[model samples]
Target: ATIGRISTGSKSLDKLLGGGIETQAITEVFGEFGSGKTQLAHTLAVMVQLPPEEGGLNGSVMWIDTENTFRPERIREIAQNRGLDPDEVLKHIAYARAFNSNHQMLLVQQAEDMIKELLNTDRPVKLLIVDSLTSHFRSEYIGRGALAERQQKLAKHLADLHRLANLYDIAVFVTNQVSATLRVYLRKGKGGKRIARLIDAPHLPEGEAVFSITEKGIED
Candidate 1:
């Protein structure tokens, strides 16, 4: 089966991924603070609103904000830069702030319902984003004694996300604050650029690509 992709608004980044973020699967982008992780998510929120000819799915987005990083202003700026209606782009994105780990997990269920409602609409939901997927888990479950419980809950949460992606055929983009590893690794680059390395993927070889974050959002 062929997987659908949604562009990340950076041509080189997309090329590095062999296309773009793959639907029916979860793509995790992790790095240190100030590494442009959330910024990339913001860019994708806007990019998903564009037509497929312009590297979008002509659909909407569902964003689960865990670190209070869902900024409408950034979405407006990126949308404006891409020659889109800022208001329209913002309107298509359904944003929710997860107060805690449980709430964060619940939001995924809520998002699934939302996707169902939009299925018959012109712009069905095509992307699901959870910014800083591990913050709530990390904070709520501390100490070595809690490690096992935390890992169990986190695994369930991830499994739910995976199921949602496959069920709806939507691209799931998650930003992680982790050392345990993820599907992709991104880091800050010198000279105001971002470097992304494919750390793990079923088909992609290990490789890296350089991109930039400018006033116009992500670019190559």
Candidate 2:
């Protein structure tokens, strides 16, 4: 089934992703502290509601905050800046907070419930974001001896995300904490603040691009 790809608010990012983030696929972004990963998340939450011609899917979003980093105030700021009604935009977003790994996984299931409820609505949930996908897993499953268990749990988490993406044709956006040396298989240096390297998505133009968290939001 053909689904709409959502724009992430950055021209370079859109270019890198060959229009924008693909529908029905999980896009994983990773960067060290202060790399502006969360900024991109917020940008997407706002951009997903734009009209199709502008690169959005014209749909609402389901945000699962595992790190307590979600800010409705920022959402309000972006919404107003983009000429969208902040109240309506905020209403379109379904926010949930997760305190642990189990709660985190459970939240996705609840999102499934939300999707079912909004299937016939004007603004059905089209995007689901889990800020910092690995924090809970990393913390709960520690040490080399726990590697097997950790990997198992992590795989299950990704599988759950994958199932949701296919079932609802929603774009799944996941952010990860990364190291400076590690990088995704993407384009060479694009200059400026190096954003995320596309570790997945072959359909997109494979390349790494730089993005900034300016006052307006995540910018190329």
Candidate 3:
């Protein structure tokens, strides 16, 4: 089957991505605080609710928020900007808060079950968002003494995410505070512009795109 792409809510960024975030793969967006990582996530949460003609998969979202950054208000703002019913868009998103690494891992398993439940529905689960994928691990594993263990667990967690993406043909969108490929590194730019550099991907070239983070959502 052809790979599905979900819009990032920025046309320029979509062009940089050769379309947008690809399904059946993991797309990691990493940057420092205030680099628009979470903002992009918020935009995508709404974007995934749109119909395919508008760049969505006509599906819902399973969001595993580790940093407590999942904001329904933000989703409403973005959905409203896109002319989607905020209440309807909010309903399609399944939200969960992960307190630690283990809980975060468990959430993916739960997400898989949810995907299966919605597989035959009019609105399936097409996106999985793990906002700030590394915070719990970073805090829980303090010294180099726990480095090996942390790496093992983190690897397993990512492996599970990959499996889910491939098995369900859904987009696994993970934001990192820190890179297995398809990684986009974001940074602040001049004025209100935010720059996103596509660092690695299987087919796409390494490139940059400038977008802005507004209350409405991500914009070129």
Candidate 4:
């Protein structure tokens, strides 16, 4: 089975991400505070509901929100602004509140089950969105001894989401938090503050990706 493709709510962003998110692959979006990661997820909640040619899915989007920032009203506004039916937009998104990494992975498993069950009917899930991967992973596994185990666990967690995308042929969107890179010379450098290096991940591209948050929704 092929993983679903990723389509950014914003066209430019899709181009930056190499023609949008991979259908079944996990596309992780991470950035600094106020960089608009959460905002982007919110926009996607509605955009995924649009028809394929218009950069949306005729299917639904599953949002696993951990930060309590998943505001349906904001998406409603965007949908209204775009001249779409708010109720229709909402119908395309399945909002799930995620408390922790373990709980989140469980949700992924359950989501897969739910989608499988739904396949018996006409409507089925076509997207999976996890608004922030590190929100609970870092806190749950604090300290050095736990870091390695945590990374492995986190990797597996992502694997579960990826499986859903592949098996069901739906898009997968995972958001990440940014971490500064440390510099050895920071203490000795002229500037008191050293620029932090970005968190590295092979699954996601490096550098910065632009994000916009408006009263309506996230944009490029």
Per-residue alpha-carbon lDDT of candidate 1 for residues 63-160, written as tens digits (9 for 90 to 100): 99887888899998989988999999999999899999999989987788899999879998899999978999999999999999999999988899
Best by lDDT: 3
- Model 3, range 1-220, lDDT digits (tens) per residue? 4889999989999999999898988999999999999999889888888888998999899999887898899999889988999999999999999999999999988788889999899998899999978999999998999999999999999999999888888999999866454899999999969999997576788899999888779988
Distance (Å) between predicted and true CA of 65, model 4? Answer: 1.5
lDDT ranking from best candidate downward: 3, 1, 2, 4
Q: Please tell me which predicted candidate would have the highest TM-score against the true structure.
A: 3
C-alpha local distance difference test of each model: 0.86, 0.78, 0.90, 0.65
* Cα lDDT of model 4 by residue, 122-209, tens digit: 5467778887777889878989989999989888887787778777877777777541111001011123221212235344454333
TM accuracy, model 3:
0.97
Candidate 2 C-alpha lDDT tens digits along 155-213:
88888888888888888888886411112332223444546566545444457666656
Backbone collision count in every prediction? 0, 2, 0, 11
Error of 1 at 181 (Å): 9.3
C-alpha TM-score for every candidate: 0.96, 0.89, 0.97, 0.79
Off by more than 4 A, model 3: none
Provide the lDDT at 64 for model 3.
Answer: 93
Error of 3 at 26 (Å): 0.5
